[PDB]
Amino acid sequence: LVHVASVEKGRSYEDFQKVYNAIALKLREDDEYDNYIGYGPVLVRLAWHISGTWDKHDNTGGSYGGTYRFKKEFNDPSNAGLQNGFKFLEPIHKEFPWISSGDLFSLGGVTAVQEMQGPKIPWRCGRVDTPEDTTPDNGRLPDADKDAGYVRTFFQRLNMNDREVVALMGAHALGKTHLKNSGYEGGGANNVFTNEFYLNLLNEDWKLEKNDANNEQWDSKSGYMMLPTDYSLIQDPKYLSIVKEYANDQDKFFKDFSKAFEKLLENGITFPKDAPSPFIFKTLEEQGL
Ligand code: HEM
Ligand SMILES: N/N=c1\cc[nH]c2ccccc12
């Protein structure tokens, strides 16, 4: 099973920068969503969940086919709440109907990370919409109630190593949990991309509690929370070393996150040797917009 990148006909960097800009302008405009968090974090989670269905063993799933647009995937319990990000993107797609679904969903995550002052994430075009019968079954995205061994094994299926896993999880500085979506109730909401996930893990006084959905989570007196899978990064000695590294080196975290997140979004895709180089989009701020 091979998925070859195919550039949308006649398109180049400037076309995609226009889509980036439309997403970024709408992020700025629709600021009230989710108690003024805005749509940045849910777009990051959307890009990760359309990519995190990938299976390295048979190349099923992943971002290429844009299959989150189909009912089976759209209605995955693991994806509860991402419909908000889909609705955000719908007018963007209407404005730029030439772009594929997979390219739009992944570009949404890149735009959100950069506009929230995160690292630049190089991004490649060419994902191609595939038919409904290529939609992966539910159950490929990870459980939150598990431990470090579960996290490590889970991410092997996405071809991610310990360093990549710990860097990707730093996205849990963003947004919040919602009891109605996932059975975890949130605290510590944020919409600026920093390494504070790692600082909070190491510096907060955590207490294991049972929430109103009967699930366990780690709560701090400051109002932050950690999933059991988050907290497992300081229970496992190999993860703990990397958590300490990122807590003490913002630039290293940004660089490692950028690589891992681009990789995540490109897993499963074969890029022709003549394909364009990855694009690095300017932020609105860099453009004076
Ligand atoms: C073991 C791996 C992971 C688990 C178990 C997990 C689990 C969860 C859960 C339960 C939520 C709360 C959803 C809600 O209630 O709305 C959440 C939110 C979120 N996750 Fe993860 N996640 C994992 C990895 C990742 C990765 C790899 C990324 C991206 C690089 C990511 C990005 C996000 C973001 C940005 C949010 C906030 C969404 C919002 O505010 O609407 N997560 N995650
Ligand atoms: N303090 N806990 C979080 C804050 C923002 N986003 C998250 C996403 C997943 C798990 C925990 C958090």
Side-chain angles (χ1 to χ4, degrees):
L1 190 44
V2 179
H3 292 324
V4 189
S6 183
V7 175
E8 291 90 335
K9 184 177 190 182
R11 300 293 163 180
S12 55
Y13 172 76
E14 175 182 332
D15 295 282
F16 295 97
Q17 178 75 69
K18 288 178 182 177
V19 181
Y20 177 103
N21 285 357
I23 296 166
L25 287 166
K26 190 178 174 63
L27 281 171
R28 178 190 286 176
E29 189 62 21
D30 301 357
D31 63 321
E32 58 289 311
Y33 172 70
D34 204 3
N35 285 117
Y36 289 93
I37 290 165
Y39 280 93
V42 73
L43 289 183
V44 175
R45 190 179 205 236
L46 178 56
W48 137 239
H49 275 208
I50 61 122
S51 300
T53 60
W54 186 60
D55 190 339
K56 68 179 182 190
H57 298 97
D58 56 8
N59 200 20
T60 59
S63 67
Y64 184 84
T67 53
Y68 173 84
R69 74 190 189 276
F70 296 116
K71 294 170 188 184
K72 174 170 61 167
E73 182 167 345
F74 193 86
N75 292 328
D76 189 349
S78 295
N79 286 335
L82 294 181
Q83 303 93 329
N84 294 295
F86 186 83
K87 290 174 187 304
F88 176 95
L89 288 174
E90 197 155 21
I92 305 291
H93 212 170
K94 284 191 177 62
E95 178 176 7
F96 302 96
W98 53 261
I99 194 174
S100 67
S101 290
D103 279 358
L104 180 58
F105 299 149
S106 58
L107 183 52
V110 168
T111 303
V113 169
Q114 296 190 177
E115 293 297 303
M116 293 189 284
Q117 303 167 55
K120 296 300 192 84
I121 318 284
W123 179 87
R124 303 182 85 157
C125 66
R127 295 165 185 78
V128 177
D129 287 5
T130 57
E132 189 156 15
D133 73 345
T134 65
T135 307
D137 287 349
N138 298 356
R140 294 184 177 211
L141 291 161
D143 298 337
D145 63 341
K146 299 292 205 291
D147 64 11
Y150 170 87
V151 173
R152 179 168 286 118
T153 300
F154 173 86
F155 273 106
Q156 282 171 354
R157 197 197 75 223
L158 294 177
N159 190 38
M160 297 292 182
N161 66 21
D162 288 358
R163 180 168 291 283
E164 289 166 322
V165 166
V166 175
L168 286 169
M169 216 73 75
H172 277 179
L174 304 166
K176 62 177 294 288
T177 65
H178 311 84
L179 205 74
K180 68 168 182 178
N181 284 348
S182 71
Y184 294 98
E185 192 28 64
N190 164 64
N191 56 12
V192 177
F193 196 103
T194 70
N195 68 336
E196 75 197 27
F197 173 77
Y198 309 100
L199 290 160
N200 291 342
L201 269 173
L202 296 173
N203 297 329
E204 295 292 297
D205 173 31
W206 298 104
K207 182 164 276 298
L208 182 63
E209 306 191 298
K210 207 149 128 179
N211 66 30
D212 297 336
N214 207 65
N215 297 318
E216 278 183 327
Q217 59 181 67
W218 293 88
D219 300 329
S220 80
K221 287 195 188 308
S222 315
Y224 292 111
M225 59 81 70
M226 296 284 171
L227 305 165
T229 46
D230 293 324
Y231 195 84
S232 85
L233 305 183
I234 60 175
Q235 296 176 313
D236 176 276
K238 300 187 195 76
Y239 287 153
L240 176 61
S241 301
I242 303 162
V243 167
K244 289 177 178 176
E245 182 179 346
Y246 294 152
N248 287 283
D249 193 337
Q250 293 179 276
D251 185 58
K252 181 63 161 145
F253 166 55
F254 268 35
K255 286 178 171 154
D256 281 1
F257 182 86
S258 177
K259 287 177 183 69
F261 195 61
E262 180 175 11
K263 174 179 168 175
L264 177 78
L265 271 44
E266 294 175 358
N267 272 337
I269 305 170
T270 297
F271 294 94
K273 310 287 323 183
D274 62 283
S277 299
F279 301 137
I280 302 189
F281 300 110
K282 301 171 183 86
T283 62
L284 293 181
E285 184 173 62
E286 284 169 331
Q287 293 170 87
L289 295 173

Coordinates of all heavy atoms in Angstrom, one line a residue, residues 171-177 186-190 197 200 206 223-227 230, ligand 2:
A171 N 2.5 19.2 23.4 CA 1.3 19.9 23.0 C 0.2 19.9 24.0 O -0.8 20.6 23.9 CB 0.7 19.2 21.7
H172 N 0.3 19.1 25.1 CA -0.7 19.1 26.2 C -0.5 20.3 27.1 O -1.2 20.5 28.1 CB -0.6 17.8 27.0 CG -1.4 16.7 26.4 ND1 -1.5 15.5 26.9 CD2 -2.2 16.7 25.2 CE1 -2.3 14.7 26.1 NE2 -2.7 15.5 25.1
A173 N 0.4 21.3 26.7 CA 0.3 22.6 27.3 C -0.9 23.4 26.7 O -1.4 24.4 27.3 CB 1.5 23.4 27.0
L174 N -1.5 22.9 25.6 CA -2.5 23.7 24.8 C -3.9 23.3 25.1 O -4.2 22.1 25.2 CB -2.3 23.5 23.3 CG -0.9 23.9 22.7 CD1 -0.8 23.3 21.3 CD2 -0.6 25.4 22.7
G175 N -4.8 24.3 25.2 CA -6.2 24.0 25.3 C -6.6 23.4 26.7 O -6.0 23.9 27.7
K176 N -7.5 22.4 26.7 CA -7.9 21.8 28.0 C -8.6 20.5 27.7 O -9.0 20.2 26.6 CB -8.7 22.8 28.8 CG -10.1 23.2 28.1 CD -10.9 24.1 29.0 CE -11.5 23.4 30.3 NZ -12.6 22.3 30.2
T177 N -8.9 19.8 28.8 CA -9.8 18.6 28.6 C -11.2 19.1 28.9 O -11.5 20.1 29.5 CB -9.4 17.4 29.5 OG1 -9.5 17.8 30.9 CG2 -7.9 17.0 29.3
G186 N -11.0 19.6 32.8 CA -9.9 20.5 32.5 C -9.5 21.5 33.6 O -10.3 21.9 34.4
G187 N -8.3 22.0 33.5 CA -7.8 23.0 34.3 C -6.6 23.5 33.5 O -6.1 22.8 32.6
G188 N -6.1 24.7 33.8 CA -4.9 25.2 33.2 C -4.9 25.5 31.7 O -3.9 25.2 31.0
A189 N -6.0 26.0 31.3 CA -6.2 26.3 29.8 C -5.2 27.3 29.3 O -4.8 28.3 29.9 CB -7.6 26.9 29.6
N190 N -4.7 27.0 28.1 CA -3.7 28.0 27.5 C -3.7 27.9 26.0 O -4.1 26.9 25.4 CB -2.4 27.6 28.1 CG -1.2 28.2 27.4 OD1 -1.1 29.4 27.3 ND2 -0.4 27.3 26.8
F197 N 4.3 22.4 29.7 CA 3.9 21.0 30.0 C 4.9 20.4 30.9 O 4.6 19.8 32.0 CB 3.6 20.2 28.7 CG 3.3 18.8 29.0 CD1 2.0 18.3 29.4 CD2 4.3 17.8 28.7 CE1 1.8 17.0 29.5 CE2 4.1 16.5 28.8 CZ 2.8 16.0 29.2
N200 N 5.4 22.2 34.4 CA 4.3 21.9 35.3 C 4.5 20.5 35.8 O 4.3 20.2 37.1 CB 2.9 22.0 34.6 CG 2.6 23.5 34.3 OD1 3.2 24.4 34.9 ND2 1.6 23.7 33.4
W206 N 1.4 17.4 42.7 CA 0.3 16.7 42.0 C -0.3 15.7 43.1 O 0.3 15.1 43.9 CB 0.9 15.8 40.9 CG 1.4 16.7 39.8 CD1 2.8 16.9 39.5 CD2 0.7 17.4 38.8 NE1 2.9 17.8 38.5 CE2 1.6 18.1 38.0 CE3 -0.7 17.7 38.6 CZ2 1.3 19.0 37.0 CZ3 -1.0 18.5 37.6 CH2 -0.1 19.2 36.8
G223 N -4.5 24.3 39.9 CA -5.6 24.1 38.9 C -5.2 23.4 37.6 O -6.0 23.2 36.7
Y224 N -3.9 22.9 37.6 CA -3.5 22.2 36.4 C -3.9 20.7 36.5 O -4.2 20.3 37.7 CB -2.0 22.2 36.2 CG -1.5 23.6 35.8 CD1 -0.7 24.4 36.7 CD2 -1.8 24.2 34.5 CE1 -0.3 25.7 36.3 CE2 -1.4 25.5 34.2 CZ -0.6 26.2 35.1 OH -0.2 27.5 34.8
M225 N -3.9 20.0 35.4 CA -4.2 18.6 35.5 C -3.4 17.8 34.5 O -2.9 18.4 33.5 CB -5.7 18.3 35.3 CG -6.3 18.7 34.1 SD -6.0 17.6 32.7 CE -7.0 16.2 33.1
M226 N -3.2 16.5 34.8 CA -2.4 15.6 33.9 C -3.2 14.3 33.8 O -3.7 13.8 34.8 CB -1.0 15.4 34.5 CG -0.1 16.6 34.6 SD 0.5 17.0 32.9 CE 1.3 18.6 33.2
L227 N -3.3 13.8 32.6 CA -3.8 12.5 32.3 C -2.9 11.5 32.9 O -1.7 11.8 33.1 CB -3.9 12.2 30.8 CG -4.8 13.2 30.1 CD1 -4.5 13.1 28.6 CD2 -6.3 13.1 30.5
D230 N 0.0 11.3 30.7 CA 0.9 12.5 30.8 C 1.9 12.2 32.0 O 3.1 12.4 31.9 CB 0.2 13.8 31.2 CG -0.7 14.3 30.0 OD1 -0.3 14.1 28.9 OD2 -1.8 14.9 30.4
Ligands
LIG2 N1 -3.2 21.3 32.6 N2 -3.6 20.2 31.7 C1 -3.8 20.5 30.4 C2 -3.9 21.8 29.9 C3 -4.1 21.9 28.5 N3 -4.3 21.0 27.6 C4 -4.3 19.7 28.1 C5 -4.5 18.6 27.2 C6 -4.4 17.3 27.6 C7 -4.2 17.0 28.9 C8 -4.0 18.0 29.9 C9 -4.0 19.4 29.5

